[PDB]
Short mmCIF file of C-alpha atoms in Angstrom, two decimals:
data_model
loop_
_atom_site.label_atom_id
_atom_site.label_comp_id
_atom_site.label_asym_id
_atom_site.label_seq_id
_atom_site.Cartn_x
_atom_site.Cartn_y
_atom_site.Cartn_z
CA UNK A 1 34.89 214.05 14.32
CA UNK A 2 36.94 211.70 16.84
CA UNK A 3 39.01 213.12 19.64
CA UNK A 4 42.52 211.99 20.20
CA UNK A 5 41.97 209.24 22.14
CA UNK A 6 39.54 208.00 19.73
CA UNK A 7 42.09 208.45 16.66
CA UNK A 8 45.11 206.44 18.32
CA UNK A 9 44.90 203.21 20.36
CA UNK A 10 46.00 203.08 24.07
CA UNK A 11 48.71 200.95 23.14
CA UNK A 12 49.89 203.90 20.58
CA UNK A 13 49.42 206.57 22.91
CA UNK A 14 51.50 205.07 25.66
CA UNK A 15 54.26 205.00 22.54
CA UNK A 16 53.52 208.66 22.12
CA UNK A 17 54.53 209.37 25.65
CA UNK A 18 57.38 207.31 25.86
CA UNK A 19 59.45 208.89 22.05
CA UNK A 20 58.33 212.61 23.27
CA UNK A 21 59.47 212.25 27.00
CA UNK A 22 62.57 210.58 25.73
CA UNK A 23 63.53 213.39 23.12
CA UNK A 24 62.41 216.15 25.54
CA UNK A 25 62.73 215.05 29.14
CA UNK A 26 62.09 218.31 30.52
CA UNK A 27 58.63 218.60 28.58
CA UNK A 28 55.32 217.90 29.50
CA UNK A 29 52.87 216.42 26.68
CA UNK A 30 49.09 217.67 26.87
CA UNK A 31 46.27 216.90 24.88
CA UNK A 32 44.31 220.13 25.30
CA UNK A 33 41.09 219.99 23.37
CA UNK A 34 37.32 221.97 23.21
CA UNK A 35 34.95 220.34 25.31
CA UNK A 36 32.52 218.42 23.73
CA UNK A 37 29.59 220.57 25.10
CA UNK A 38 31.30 223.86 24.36
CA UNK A 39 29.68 225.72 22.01
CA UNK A 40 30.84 229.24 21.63
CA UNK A 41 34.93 229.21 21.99
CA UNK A 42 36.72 228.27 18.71
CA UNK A 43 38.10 225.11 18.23
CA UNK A 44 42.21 225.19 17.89
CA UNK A 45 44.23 223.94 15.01
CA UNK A 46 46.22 222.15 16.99
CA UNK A 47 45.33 220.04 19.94
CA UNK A 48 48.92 218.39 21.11
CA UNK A 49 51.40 220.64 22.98
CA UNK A 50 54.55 220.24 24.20
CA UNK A 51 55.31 222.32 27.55
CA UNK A 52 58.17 223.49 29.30
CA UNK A 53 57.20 221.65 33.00
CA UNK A 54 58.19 225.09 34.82
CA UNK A 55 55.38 226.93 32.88
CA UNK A 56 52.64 227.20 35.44
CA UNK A 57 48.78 227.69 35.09
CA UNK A 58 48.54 231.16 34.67
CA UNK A 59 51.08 231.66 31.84
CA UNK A 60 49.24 228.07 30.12
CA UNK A 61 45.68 230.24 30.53
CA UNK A 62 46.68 233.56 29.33
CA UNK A 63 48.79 231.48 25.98
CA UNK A 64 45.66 229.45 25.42
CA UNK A 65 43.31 232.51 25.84
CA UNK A 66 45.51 234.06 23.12
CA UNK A 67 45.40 230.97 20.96
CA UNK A 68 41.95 231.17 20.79
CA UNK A 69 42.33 235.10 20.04
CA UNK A 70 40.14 235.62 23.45
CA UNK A 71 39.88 238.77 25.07
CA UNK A 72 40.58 239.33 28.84
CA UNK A 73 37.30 239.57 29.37
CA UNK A 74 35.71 236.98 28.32
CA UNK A 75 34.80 233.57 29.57
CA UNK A 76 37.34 230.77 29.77
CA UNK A 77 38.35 227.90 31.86
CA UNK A 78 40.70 224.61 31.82
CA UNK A 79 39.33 221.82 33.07
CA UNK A 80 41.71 218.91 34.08
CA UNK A 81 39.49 215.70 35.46
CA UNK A 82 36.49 217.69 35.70
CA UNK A 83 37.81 220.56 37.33
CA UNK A 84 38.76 224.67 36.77
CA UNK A 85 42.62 225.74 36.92
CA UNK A 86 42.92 228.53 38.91
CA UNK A 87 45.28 230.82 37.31
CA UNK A 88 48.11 230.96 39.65
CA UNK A 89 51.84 229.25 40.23
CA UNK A 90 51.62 225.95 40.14
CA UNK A 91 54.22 224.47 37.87
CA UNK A 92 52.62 222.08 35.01
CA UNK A 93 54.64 219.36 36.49
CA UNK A 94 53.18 219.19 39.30
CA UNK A 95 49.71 218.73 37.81
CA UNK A 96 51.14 216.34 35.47
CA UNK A 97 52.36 214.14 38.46
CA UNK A 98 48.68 214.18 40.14
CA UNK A 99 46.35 214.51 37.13
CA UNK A 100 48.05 212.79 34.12
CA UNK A 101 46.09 209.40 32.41
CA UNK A 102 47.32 206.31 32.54
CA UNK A 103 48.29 206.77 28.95
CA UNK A 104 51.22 209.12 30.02
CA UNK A 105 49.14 212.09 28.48
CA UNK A 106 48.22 215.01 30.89
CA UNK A 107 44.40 215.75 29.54
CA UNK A 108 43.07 219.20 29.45
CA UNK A 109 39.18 220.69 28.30
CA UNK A 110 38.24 224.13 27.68
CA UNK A 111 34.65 225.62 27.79
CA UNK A 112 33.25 229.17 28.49
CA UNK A 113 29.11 229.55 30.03
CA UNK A 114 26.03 228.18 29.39
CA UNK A 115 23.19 230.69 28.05
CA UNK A 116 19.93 231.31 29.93
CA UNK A 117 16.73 231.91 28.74
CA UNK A 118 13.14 230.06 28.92
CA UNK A 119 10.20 229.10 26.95
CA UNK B 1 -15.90 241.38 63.84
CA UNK B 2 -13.17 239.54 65.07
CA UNK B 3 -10.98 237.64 62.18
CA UNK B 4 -8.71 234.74 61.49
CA UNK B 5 -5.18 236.69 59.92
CA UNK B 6 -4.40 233.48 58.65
CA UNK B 7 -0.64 233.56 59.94
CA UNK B 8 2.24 232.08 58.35
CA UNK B 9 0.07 231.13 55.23
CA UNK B 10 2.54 231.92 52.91
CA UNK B 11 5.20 229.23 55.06
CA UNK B 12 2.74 226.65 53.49
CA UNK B 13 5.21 225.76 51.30
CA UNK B 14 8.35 225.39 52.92
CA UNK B 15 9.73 222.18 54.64
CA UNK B 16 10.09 221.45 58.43
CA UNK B 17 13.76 220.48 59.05
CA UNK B 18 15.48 222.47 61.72
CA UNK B 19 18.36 223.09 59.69
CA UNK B 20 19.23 226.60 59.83
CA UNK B 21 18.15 229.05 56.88
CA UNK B 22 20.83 231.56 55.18
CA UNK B 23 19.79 234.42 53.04
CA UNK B 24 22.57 236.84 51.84
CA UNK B 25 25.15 236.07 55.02
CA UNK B 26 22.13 235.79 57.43
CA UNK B 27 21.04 232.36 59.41
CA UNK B 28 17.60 232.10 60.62
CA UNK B 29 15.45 229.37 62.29
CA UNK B 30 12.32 228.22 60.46
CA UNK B 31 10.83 227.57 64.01
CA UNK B 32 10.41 230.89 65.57
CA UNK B 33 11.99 233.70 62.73
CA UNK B 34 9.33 232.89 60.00
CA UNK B 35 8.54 236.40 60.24
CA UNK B 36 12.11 237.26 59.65
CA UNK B 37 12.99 235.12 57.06
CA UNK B 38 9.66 236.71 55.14
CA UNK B 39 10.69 240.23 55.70
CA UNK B 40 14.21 239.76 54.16
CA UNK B 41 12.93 237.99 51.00
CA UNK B 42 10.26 240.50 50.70
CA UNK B 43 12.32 243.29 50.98
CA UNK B 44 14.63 242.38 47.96
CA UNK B 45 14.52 243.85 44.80
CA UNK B 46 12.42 241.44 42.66
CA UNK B 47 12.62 241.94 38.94
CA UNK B 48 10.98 239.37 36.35
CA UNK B 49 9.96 239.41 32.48
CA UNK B 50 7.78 242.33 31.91
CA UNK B 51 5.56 243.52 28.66
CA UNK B 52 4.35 246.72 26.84
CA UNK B 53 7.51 248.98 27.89
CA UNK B 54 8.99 251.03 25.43
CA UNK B 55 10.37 249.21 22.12
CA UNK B 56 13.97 248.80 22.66
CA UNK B 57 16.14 250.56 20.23
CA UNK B 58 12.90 252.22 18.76
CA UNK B 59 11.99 249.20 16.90
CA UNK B 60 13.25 245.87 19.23
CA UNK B 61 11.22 244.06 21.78
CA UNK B 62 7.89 245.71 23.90
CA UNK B 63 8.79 242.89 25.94
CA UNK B 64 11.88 239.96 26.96
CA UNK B 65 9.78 237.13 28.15
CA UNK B 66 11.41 234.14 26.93
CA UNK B 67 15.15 235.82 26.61
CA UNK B 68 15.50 238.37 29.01
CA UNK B 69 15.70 235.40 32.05
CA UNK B 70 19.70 235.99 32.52
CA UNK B 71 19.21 239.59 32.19
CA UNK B 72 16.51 239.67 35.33
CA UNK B 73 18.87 237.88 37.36
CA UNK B 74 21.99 240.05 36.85
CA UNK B 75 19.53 243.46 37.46
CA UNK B 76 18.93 241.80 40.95
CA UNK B 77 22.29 240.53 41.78
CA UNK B 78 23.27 244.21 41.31
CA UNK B 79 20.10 245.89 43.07
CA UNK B 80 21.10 243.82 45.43
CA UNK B 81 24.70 245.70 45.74
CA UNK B 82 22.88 248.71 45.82
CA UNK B 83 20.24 248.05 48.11
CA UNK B 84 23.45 247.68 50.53
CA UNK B 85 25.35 250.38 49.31
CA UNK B 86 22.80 252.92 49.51
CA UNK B 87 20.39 251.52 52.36
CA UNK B 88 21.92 248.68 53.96
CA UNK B 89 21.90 245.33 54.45
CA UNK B 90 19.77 245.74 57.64
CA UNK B 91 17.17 247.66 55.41
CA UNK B 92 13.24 245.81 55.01
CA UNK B 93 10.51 247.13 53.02
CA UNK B 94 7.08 247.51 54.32
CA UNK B 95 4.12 247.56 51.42
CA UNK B 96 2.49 250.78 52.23
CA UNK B 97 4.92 252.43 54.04
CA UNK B 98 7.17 255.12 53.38
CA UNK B 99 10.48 254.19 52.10
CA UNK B 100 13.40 256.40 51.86
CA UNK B 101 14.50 258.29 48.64
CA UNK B 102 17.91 256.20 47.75
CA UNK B 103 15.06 253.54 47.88
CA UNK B 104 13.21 254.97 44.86
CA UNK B 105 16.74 255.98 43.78
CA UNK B 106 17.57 252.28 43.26
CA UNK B 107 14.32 251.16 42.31
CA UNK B 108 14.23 253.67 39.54
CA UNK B 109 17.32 252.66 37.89
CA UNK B 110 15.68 249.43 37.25
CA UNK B 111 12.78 250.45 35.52
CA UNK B 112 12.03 249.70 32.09
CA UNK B 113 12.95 252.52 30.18
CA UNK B 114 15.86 253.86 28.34
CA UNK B 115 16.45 256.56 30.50
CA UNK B 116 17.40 254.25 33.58
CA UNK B 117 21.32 253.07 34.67
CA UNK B 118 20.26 249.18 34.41
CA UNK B 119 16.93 248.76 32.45
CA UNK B 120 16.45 246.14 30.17
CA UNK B 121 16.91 248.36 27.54
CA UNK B 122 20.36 249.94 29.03
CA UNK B 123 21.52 246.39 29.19
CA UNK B 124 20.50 244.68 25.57
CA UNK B 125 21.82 247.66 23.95
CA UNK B 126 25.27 247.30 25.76
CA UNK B 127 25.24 243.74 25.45
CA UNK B 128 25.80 244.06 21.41
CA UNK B 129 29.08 245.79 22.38
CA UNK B 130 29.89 242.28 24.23
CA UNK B 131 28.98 240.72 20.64
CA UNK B 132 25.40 239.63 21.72
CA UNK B 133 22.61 240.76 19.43
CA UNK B 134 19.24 242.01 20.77
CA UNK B 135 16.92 238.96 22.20
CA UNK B 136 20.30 236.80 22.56
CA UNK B 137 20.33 234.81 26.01
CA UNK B 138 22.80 235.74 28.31
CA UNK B 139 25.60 233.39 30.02
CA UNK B 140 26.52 234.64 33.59
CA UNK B 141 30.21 237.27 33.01
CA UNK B 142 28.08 238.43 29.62
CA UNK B 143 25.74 240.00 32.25
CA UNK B 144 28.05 240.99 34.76
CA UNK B 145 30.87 242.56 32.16
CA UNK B 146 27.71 244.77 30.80
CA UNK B 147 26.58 245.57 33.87
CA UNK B 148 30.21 247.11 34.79
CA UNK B 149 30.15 248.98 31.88
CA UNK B 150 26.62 250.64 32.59
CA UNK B 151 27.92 251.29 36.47
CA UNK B 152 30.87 253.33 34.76
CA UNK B 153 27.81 256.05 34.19
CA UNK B 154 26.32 255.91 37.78
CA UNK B 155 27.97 258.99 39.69
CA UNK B 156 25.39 258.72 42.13
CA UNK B 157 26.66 255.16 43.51
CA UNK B 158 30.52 255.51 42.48
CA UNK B 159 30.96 251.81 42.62
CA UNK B 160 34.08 249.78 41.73
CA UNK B 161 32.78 246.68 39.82
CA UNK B 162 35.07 244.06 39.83
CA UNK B 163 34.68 240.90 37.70
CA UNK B 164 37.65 238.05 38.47
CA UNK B 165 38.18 235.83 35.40
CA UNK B 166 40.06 232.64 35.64
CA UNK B 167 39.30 231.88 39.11
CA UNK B 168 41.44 234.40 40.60
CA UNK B 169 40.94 236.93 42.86
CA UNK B 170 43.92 239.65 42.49
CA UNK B 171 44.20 241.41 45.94
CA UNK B 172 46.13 244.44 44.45
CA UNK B 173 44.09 244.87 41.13
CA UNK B 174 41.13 245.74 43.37
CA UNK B 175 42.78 247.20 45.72
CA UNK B 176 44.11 249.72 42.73
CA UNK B 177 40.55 250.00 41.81
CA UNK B 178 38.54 251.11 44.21
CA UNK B 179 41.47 253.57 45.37
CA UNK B 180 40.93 254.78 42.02
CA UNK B 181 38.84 257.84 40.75
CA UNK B 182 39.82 256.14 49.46
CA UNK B 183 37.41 253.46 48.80
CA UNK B 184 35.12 253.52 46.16
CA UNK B 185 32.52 250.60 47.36
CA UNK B 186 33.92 247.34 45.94
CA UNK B 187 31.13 245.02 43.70
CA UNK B 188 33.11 241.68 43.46
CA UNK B 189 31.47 239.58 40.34
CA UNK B 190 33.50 235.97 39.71
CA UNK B 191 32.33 233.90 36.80
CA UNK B 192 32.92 229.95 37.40
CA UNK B 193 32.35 226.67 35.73
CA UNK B 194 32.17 224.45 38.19
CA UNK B 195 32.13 221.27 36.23
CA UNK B 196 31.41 219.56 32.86
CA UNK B 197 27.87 218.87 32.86
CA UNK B 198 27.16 219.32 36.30
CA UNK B 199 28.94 220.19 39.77
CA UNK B 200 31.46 218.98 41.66
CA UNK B 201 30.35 217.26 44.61
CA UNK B 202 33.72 219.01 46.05
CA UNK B 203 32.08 222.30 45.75
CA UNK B 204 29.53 221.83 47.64
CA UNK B 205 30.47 222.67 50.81
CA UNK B 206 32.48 225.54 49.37
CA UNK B 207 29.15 227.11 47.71
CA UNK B 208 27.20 227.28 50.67
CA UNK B 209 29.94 229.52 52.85
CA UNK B 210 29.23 231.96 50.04
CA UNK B 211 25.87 232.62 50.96
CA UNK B 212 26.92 232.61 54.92
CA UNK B 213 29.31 235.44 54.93
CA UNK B 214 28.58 239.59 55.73
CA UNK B 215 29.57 240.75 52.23
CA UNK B 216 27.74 237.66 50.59
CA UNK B 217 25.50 239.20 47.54
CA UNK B 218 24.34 235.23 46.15
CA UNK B 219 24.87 233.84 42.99
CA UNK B 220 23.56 233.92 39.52
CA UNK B 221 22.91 230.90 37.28
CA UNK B 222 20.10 228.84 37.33
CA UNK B 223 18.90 224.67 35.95
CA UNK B 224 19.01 224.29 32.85
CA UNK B 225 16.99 226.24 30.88
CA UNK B 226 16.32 228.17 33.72
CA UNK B 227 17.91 230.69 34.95
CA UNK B 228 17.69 232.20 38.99
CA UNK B 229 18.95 234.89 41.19
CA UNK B 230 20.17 232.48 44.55
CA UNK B 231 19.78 234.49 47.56
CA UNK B 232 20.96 231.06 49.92
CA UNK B 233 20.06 227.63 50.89
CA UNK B 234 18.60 225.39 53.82
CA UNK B 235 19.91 221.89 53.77
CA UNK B 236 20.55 220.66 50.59
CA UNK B 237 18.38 222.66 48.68
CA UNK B 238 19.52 226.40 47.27
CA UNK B 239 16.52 229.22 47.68
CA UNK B 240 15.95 231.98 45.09
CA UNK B 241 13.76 234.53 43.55
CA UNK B 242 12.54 233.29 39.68
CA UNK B 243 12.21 235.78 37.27
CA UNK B 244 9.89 233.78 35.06
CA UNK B 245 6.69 235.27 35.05
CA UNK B 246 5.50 238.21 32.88
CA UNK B 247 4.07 241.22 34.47
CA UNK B 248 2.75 244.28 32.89
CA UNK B 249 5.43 247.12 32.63
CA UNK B 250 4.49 249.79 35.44
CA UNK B 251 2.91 252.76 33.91
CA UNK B 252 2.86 255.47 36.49
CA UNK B 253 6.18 254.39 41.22
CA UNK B 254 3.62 251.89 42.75
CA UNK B 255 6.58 248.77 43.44
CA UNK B 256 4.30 245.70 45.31
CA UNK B 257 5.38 244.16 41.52
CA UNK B 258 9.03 244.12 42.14
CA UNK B 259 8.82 242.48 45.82
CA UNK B 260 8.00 239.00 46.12
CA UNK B 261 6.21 238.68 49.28
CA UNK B 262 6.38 234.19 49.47
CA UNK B 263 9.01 232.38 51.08
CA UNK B 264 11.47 231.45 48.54
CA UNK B 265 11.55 228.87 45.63
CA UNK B 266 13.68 226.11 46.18
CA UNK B 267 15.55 223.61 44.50
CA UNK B 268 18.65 220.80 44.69
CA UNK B 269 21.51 222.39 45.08
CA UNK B 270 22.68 218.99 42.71
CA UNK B 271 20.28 220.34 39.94
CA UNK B 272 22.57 223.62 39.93
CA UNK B 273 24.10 224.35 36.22
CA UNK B 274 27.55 224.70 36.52
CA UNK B 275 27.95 227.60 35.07
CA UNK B 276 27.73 230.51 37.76
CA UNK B 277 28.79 233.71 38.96
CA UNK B 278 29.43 234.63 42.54
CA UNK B 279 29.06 237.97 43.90
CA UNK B 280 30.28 240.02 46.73
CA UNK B 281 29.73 243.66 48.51
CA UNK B 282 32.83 245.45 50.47
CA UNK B 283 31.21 248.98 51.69
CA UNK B 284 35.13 249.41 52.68
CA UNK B 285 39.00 248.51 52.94
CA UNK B 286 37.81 246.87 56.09
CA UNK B 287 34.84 245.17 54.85
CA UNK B 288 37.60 243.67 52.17
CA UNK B 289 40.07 242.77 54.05
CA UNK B 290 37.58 240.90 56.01
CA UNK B 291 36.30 239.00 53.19
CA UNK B 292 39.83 238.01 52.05
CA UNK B 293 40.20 236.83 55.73
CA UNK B 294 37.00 234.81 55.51
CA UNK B 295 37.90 233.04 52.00
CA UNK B 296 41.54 232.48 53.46
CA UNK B 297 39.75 230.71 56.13
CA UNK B 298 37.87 228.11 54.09
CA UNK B 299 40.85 226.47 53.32
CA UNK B 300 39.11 223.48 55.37
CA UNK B 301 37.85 219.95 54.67
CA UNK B 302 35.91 221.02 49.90
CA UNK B 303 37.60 221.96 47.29
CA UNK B 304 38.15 225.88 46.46
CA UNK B 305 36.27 227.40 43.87
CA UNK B 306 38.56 230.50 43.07
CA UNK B 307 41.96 231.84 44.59
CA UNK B 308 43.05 234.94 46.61
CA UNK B 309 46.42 236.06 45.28
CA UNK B 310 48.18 239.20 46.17
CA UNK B 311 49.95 239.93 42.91
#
């Protein structure tokens, strides 16, 4: 199946951004979606999320973690531009300002581990 | 007769570069510590597949060649702790000579039999608990998370086995911990992804200061499809003991087996699956709060892997 940016145009996505920012300026749109590699987590029913741009990166884990019905102790991490979000304090916005695309969205992945084994 | 002892034969494989050598938090030259550098890879606990040991579960696997690679690296990580807990990091083992009895101690609880703290068997049987079945491979925290559980039942080492998810590193959780029943010794296990498909050039630099501190224990993970026990690096290239390679079960404890007496394999630390797990020893408070001091510290030019945060 297609991701988002493969189901609306550049053109439309930019359009996305500019209705949702102008309805809710205090908002942060992210595309948060399973890496394509993942394997094991659960794929979410939705994919688009609207969020408060005070929420920082550990309250956006632990809500995704429970969107995906994870336990505590399993594995889980948010990748933004090829990189792990430390769960701590930093306010979405601030992310938003230094990692968002050039569409206006703020792109997020999530994967657990790879398995080990040999032949 | 007088005889050639063939010397440094075993060095015949490893490079010539002058750039230093780190093995668990220790630097030594490939010029004139050879002999070193052999003696501290020797003397760690080496544990790879093995065959004809008791069915696990009564009527599972005589054997976990092919699936138990993961499994052999997490039983060494954590010999590793308790090689240091109970002996030392200072400790080397001598083929032939007598070793003490926390040496068998440890040694024993890796065994292949039901009856041991961290055998094979202890572990795939815990493991289902976790939601993995019996001859499923492992990822990194699925080994580490079982392998706190199974500690839980080790009086004899009392450790507190800590295992940071989300890339965080909460002071006062562990702190709570191993005051908890003052200092229980502290085993510090912290699952990463360190990338998509491979890692982060920004790491990099980050990585390698694991294997150079005190409390440094190395890191589980391996290539893909391959999974390895890193005990450091020289240059750009990470060393590290490889499970893969079946050896009977020992059926007395004769233990030449479970040391491997070559200098280690090696391979591009840009070859490294991102998917890892760090680990970390604090004897005590102090040994802590001087790890916490040393990861505060590498807040220089590489990009952190996972943050200290108080509360």
């Amino acid at each position: 199946e297609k991701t988002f940016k493969q189901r609306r145009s550049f053109e439309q996505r930019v359009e996305d951004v500019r209705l949702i920012r102008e309805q809710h300026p205090t908002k942060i749109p992210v595309i948060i979606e399973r890496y394509k590699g993942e394997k094991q987590l659960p794929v979410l029913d939705k994919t688009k999320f609207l969020v408060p741009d005070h929420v920082n990166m550990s309250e956006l884990i632990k809500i995704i973690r429970r969107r995906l019905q994870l336990n505590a102790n399993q594995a889980f991490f948010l990748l933004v531009n090829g990189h792990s979000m430390v769960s701590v304090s930093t306010p979405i916005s601030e992310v938003y300002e230094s990692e968002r695309d050039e569409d206006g969205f703020l792109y997020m992945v999530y994967a657990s581990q790879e398995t080990f084994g040999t032949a | 007769l007088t005889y050639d002892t063939l010397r440094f034969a075993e060095f015949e494989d490893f490079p010539e570069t002058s750039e230093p050598v780190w093995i668990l938090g220790r630097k030594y030259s490939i010029f004139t510590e050879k002999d070193e550098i052999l003696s501290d890879v020797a003397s760690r606990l080496w544990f790879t597949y093995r065959k004809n040991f008791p069915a696990i579960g009564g009527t599972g696997p005589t054997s976990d060649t092919g699936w138990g690679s993961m499994l052999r690296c997490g039983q060494m990580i954590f010999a590793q702790a308790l090689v240091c807990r109970h002996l030392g990091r200072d400790w080397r083992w001598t083929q032939r000579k007598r070793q003490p009895d926390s040496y068998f101690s440890v040694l024993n609880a890796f065994i292949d039999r039901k009856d041991s703290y961290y055998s094979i068997h202890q572990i795939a049987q815990m493991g289902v608990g976790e939601g993995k079945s019996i001859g499923q491979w492992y990822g990194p925290n699925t080994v580490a998370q079982v392998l706190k559980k199974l500690a839980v039942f080790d009086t004899w080492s009392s450790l507190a086995v800590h295992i940071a998810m989300d890339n965080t590193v909460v002071m006062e959780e562990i702190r709570r911990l191993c005051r908890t029943s003052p200092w229980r010794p502290l085993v510090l296990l912290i699952p990463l992804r360190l990338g998509l498909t491979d890692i982060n050039e920004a790491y990099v630099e980050t990585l390698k200061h694991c294997f150079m501190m005190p409390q440094s224990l190395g890191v589980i993970g391996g290539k893909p499809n391959s999974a390895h026990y890193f005990i450091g690096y020289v240059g750009e290239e990470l060393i590290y003991l490889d499970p893969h390679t079946t050896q009977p079960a020992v059926e007395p404890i004769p233990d030449e087996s479970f040391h491997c007496q070559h200098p280690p394999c090696r391979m591009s630390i840009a070859e490294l699956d991102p998917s890892i797990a760090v680990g970390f020893f604090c004897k005590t408070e102090d040994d802590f709060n001087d790890w916490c001091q040393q990861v505060k510290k590498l807040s220089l030019l590489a990009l952190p892997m996972f943050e200290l945060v108080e509360q």
